[PDB]
Amino acid sequence: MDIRPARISDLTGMQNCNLHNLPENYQLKYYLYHAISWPMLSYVATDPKGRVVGYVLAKMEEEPKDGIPHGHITSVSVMRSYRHLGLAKRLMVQSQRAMVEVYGAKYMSLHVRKSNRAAIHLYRDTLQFDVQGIESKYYADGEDAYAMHKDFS
């Protein structure tokens, strides 16, 4: 229930939260890579015992499209127990603010599989994302991915 900027010490906790609800995983060095390259972009939700419950792994695009800077959500999830609370929405708005203020991001982007109803309903409806397009067989299982964009204007 405590949301806050992510630290180095809670990176492994984010990885665990990712290994629990996503198919869709990276090794810790890539989390380390996010912390060092963009230290204030990632946020974390925490249970009373100090363990990571939800998170948002955020970054700025290393190779920007057309030269305009923009943010990218690489991963976000909440443990099944703590869902339907507002944790994800609140994690996103904190990370979004940091993208704009620190890095001057003109927009933000992510990928979602077409069959994920909870995710789409989160971005397109409550977070006001637009569907930029569809990427064929983006995921390992061959499922198509919606490319979502939120323009800041």
Partner 1 sequence: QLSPKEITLFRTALKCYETKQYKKGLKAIEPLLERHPEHGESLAIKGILLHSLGNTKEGYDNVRLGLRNDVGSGVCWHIFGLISRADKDYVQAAKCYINAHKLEKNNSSLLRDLALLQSQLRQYKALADTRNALLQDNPGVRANWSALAVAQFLRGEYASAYKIVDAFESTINQGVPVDTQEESEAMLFMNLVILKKDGVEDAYKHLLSIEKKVLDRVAFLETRAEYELYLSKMEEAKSTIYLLLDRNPDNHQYYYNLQRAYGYEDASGKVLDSAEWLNLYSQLAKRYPKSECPTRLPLEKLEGDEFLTHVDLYLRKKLKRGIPSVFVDVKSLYKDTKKCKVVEDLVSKYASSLSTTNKFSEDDDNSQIEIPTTLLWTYYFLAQHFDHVGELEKAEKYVDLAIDHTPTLVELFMTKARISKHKGELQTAMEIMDHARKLDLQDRFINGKCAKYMLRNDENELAAKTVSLFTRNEAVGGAVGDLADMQCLWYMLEDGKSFARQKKFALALKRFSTVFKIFDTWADDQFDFHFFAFRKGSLRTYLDLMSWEDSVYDDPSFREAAQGSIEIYFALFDLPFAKYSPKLPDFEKLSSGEINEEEEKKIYKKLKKDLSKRLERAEKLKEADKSRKYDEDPLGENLVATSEPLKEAQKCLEKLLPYGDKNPSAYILAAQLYTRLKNFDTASKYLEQAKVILGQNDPTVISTEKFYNSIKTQSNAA
Ligand X SMILES: CC(=O)SCCNC(=O)CCNC(=O)[C@H](O)C(C)(C)COP(=O)(O)OP(=O)(O)OC[C@H]1O[C@@H](n2cnc3c(N)ncnc32)[C@H](O)[C@@H]1OP(=O)(O)O
- Is 84 a binder of ligand X (CB under 6 A)? yes
- Is 63 a binder of partner 1 (CB under 8 A)? no
Question: Given 3-state DSSP classes, what are the helix, strand and coil percentages for the chain, each rounded to the nearest 5?
Answer: 35, 30, 35
* One-letter identity of residue 122: L
Place of tokens 């198509």: 144
Compose the 1-30 pattern: x for residues touching ligand X by CB under 6 A, - for all others: --------------------xx--------
- Is 141 a binder of Na ion (CB under 5 A)? yes
Residue 45 and residue 1 in contact, taking contact as beta carbons nearer than 8 Å: yes
Place of tokens 């890095």: 103
Residues lying near partner 1 in the complex (CB under 8 A): 1-5, 7-9, 12, 15-16, 19-23, 25-29, 32, 35-37, 39-40, 47-48, 79-86, 90, 94, 97-98, 101-103, 115, 140
